[PDB]
Amino acid sequence: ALSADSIFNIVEEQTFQYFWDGAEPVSGMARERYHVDGNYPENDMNVVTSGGSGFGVMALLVGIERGYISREQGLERLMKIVSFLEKADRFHGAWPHWLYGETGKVKPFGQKDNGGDLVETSFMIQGLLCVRQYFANGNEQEKALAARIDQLWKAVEFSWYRNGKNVLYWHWSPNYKWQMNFPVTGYNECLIMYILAAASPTHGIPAEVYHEGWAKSGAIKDSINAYGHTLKLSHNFAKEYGGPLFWSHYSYLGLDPHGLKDRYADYWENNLNHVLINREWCIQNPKHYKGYGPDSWGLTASYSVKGYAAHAPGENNDLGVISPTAALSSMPYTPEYSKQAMVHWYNDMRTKIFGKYGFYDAFSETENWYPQQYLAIDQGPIVVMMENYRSGLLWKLFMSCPEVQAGLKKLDFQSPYL
Numbered sequence: 361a362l363s364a365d366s367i368f369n370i371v372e373e374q375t376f377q378y379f380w381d382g383a384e385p386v387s388g389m390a391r392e393r394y395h396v397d398g399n400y401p402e403n404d405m406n407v408v409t410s411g412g413s414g415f416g417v418m419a420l421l422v423g424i425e426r427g428y429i430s431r432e433q434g435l436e437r438l439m440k441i442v443s444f445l446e447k448a449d450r451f452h453g454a455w456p457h458w459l460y461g462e463t464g465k466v467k468p469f470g471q472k473d474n475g476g477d478l479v480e481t482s483f484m485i486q487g488l489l490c491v492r493q494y495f496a497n498g499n500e501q502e503k504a505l506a507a508r509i510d511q512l513w514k515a516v517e518f519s520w521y522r523n524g525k526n527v528l529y530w531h532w533s534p535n536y537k538w539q540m541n542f543p544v545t546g547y548n549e550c551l552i553m554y555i556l557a558a559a560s561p562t563h564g565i566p567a568e569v570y571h572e573g574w575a576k577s578g579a580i581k582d583s584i585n586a587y588g589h590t591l592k593l594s595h596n597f598a599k600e601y602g603g604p605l606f607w608s609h610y611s612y613l614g615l616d617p618h619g620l621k622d623r624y625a626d627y628w629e630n631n632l633n634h635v636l637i638n639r640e641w642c643i644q645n646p647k648h649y650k651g652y653g654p655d656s657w658g659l660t661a662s663y664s665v666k667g668y669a670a671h672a673p674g675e676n677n678d679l680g681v682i683s684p685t686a687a688l689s690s691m692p693y694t695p696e697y698s699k700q701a702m703v704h705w706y707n708d709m710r711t712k713i714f715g716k717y718g719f720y721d722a723f724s725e726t727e728n729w730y731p732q733q734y735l736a737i738d739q740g741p742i743v744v745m746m747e748n749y750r751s752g753l754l755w756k757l758f759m760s761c762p763e764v765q766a767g768l769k770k771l772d773f774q775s776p777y778l
């Protein structure tokens with residue numbers, strides 16, 4: 361029976377290994393998935409994911425900082441990644457969701473999603489900007505990396521994805537054009553795309569794209585009340601309890617939500633309340649699933665008993681599946697509650713739910729379902745948020761970008777970093 365502190369470092373280190381020992385070997389990029397038993401129904405073990413690899417380059421910086429790898433080891437790996445990303449398919453400067461690791465060519469995420477994915481590109485840029493800042497004051501080779509990252513950053517054509525409108529579209533294809541037809545309106549996980557779009561010095565957006573598009577001219581404001589907690593953001597399709605918990609993770613890995621506010625919300629309090637509602641649902645456990653309680657909580661999108669599902673509170677959304685990234689990546693918001701789950705899982709369940717790349721993606725005690733499987737997009741925010749809770753690493757780096765601060769000012773945000 362180990363201490364939280366011992367467990368914390370074991371979990372952080374092993375989770376980081378998804379992105380190191382687990383990386384696709386040619387590219388260095390994060391695999392979409394890793395299945396311990398070697399069985400890949402889609403034969404896609406070496407398909408890498410642009411968004412999750414953004415998480416992973418952050419994780420590499422955690423690795424250098426915690427001594428998991430040397431500074432030099434980290435640098436050479438990031439160099440390899442950036443080389444790959446310089447030759448990979450880009451679609452008005454945005455990477456696709458999926459790439460073949462060995463070649464850097466697109467794998468369509470469904471037939472018509474065969475071009476750019478601006479949302480996944482934004483998670484890659486959040487992470488690559490942290491790397492730019494980390495190296496900006498090092499040696500000749502570190503600065504040339506920082507510059508090549510700056511170049512990739514500046515070539516993302518955020519404005520292209522407006523398609524002439526006051527909003528950003530998620531996708532664009534060479535041949536299918538705008539047929540995916542997903543204009544990105546809030547609230548969902550995608551805030552960082554609009555912030556980066558405003559920040560871009562070469563291909564930015566005017567403020568109306570954010571206010572009329574993301575914010576729906578104010579219709580993003582809501583009042584979702586559960587367990588005595590209020591969300592003031594209109595969580596898309598989740599007006600009872602808020603969405604899957606990762607919405608309070610992905611856009612907040614670099615962007616620091618502490619003290620972040622604008623006319624639509626106080627992001628700290630809304631992110632926190634999102635977590636506390638999620639946890640409370642698991643404590644009340646209305647569907648009477650096995651294992652739900654204060655030592656085992658957190659619903660988010662992940663592998664599921666019948667495949668993959670966007671788990672969340674509500675009788676229609678909670679499938680008896682707990683996914684560790686929900687509670688663990690919530691460490692900066694709810695450290696003691698996130699540690700409570702982490703400790704129970706490690707001390708009492710590790711032989712079922714803990715593996716070489718940290719805790720597995722999802723489990724159901726109701727169904728005795730304990731797949732030895734992992735997803736980049738679930739492991740990455742665990743490593744990153746655990747380190748943010750510890751030291752602020754990625755927040756410090758990201759928030760230091762002059763362009764991030766300008767973009768936040770342009771969109772009428774408040775934050776101490778400004």
Ligand SMILES: OC[C@H]1O[C@@H](O[C@H]2[C@H](O[C@@H]3[C@@H](O)[C@H](O)[C@@H](CO)O[C@H]3O)O[C@H](CO)[C@@H](O)[C@@H]2O)[C@H](O)[C@@H](O)[C@@H]1O
Binds near residue numbers: 547548549
């Ligand atoms: O396939 C498009 C895009 O979907 C992203 O999911 C969004 C989800 O989008 C769903 C869409 O996928 C679904 O087919 C239709 C009808 O069922 O409705 C939309 O809501 O919406 C939520 C709420 O805004 C987002 O959190 C979620 O991420 C995938 O993430 C993305 O990878 C994919 O390209």
Ligand SMILES: OC[C@H]1O[C@@H](O)[C@H](O)[C@@H](O)[C@@H]1O
Binds near residue numbers: 392393735737
């Ligand atoms: O990217 C995360 C997951 O999204 C799901 O919709 C897809 O079916 C999976 O291939 C993928 O692992």
Ligand SMILES: [K+]
Binds near residue numbers: 403
């Ligand atoms: K197979």
